[PDB]
Amino acid sequence: QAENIYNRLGEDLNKWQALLVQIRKARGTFDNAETKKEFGPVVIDYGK
């Protein structure tokens, strides 16, 4: 819920900075060069 997220954020500069940092880390995590992650002897990864 975008409105709920914005309301939870409020207008704190520190809150905005922290949200930006967390968003950057998360956008780093999901999505990468490879397609299917092979983490383990049996690997299930989702290109779609």
């Binding site: 956008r27 780093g28 999505d31 990468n32 060069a33």
Partner: peptide
Amino acid sequence: GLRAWTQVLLKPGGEPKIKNVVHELRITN
């Protein structure tokens, strides 16, 4: 050998080979 390598880029002459190249894409950010 230098002439042959130049041609390959393009018997005592020789004929070397070539490797691959760094070609790819990303959307990281």
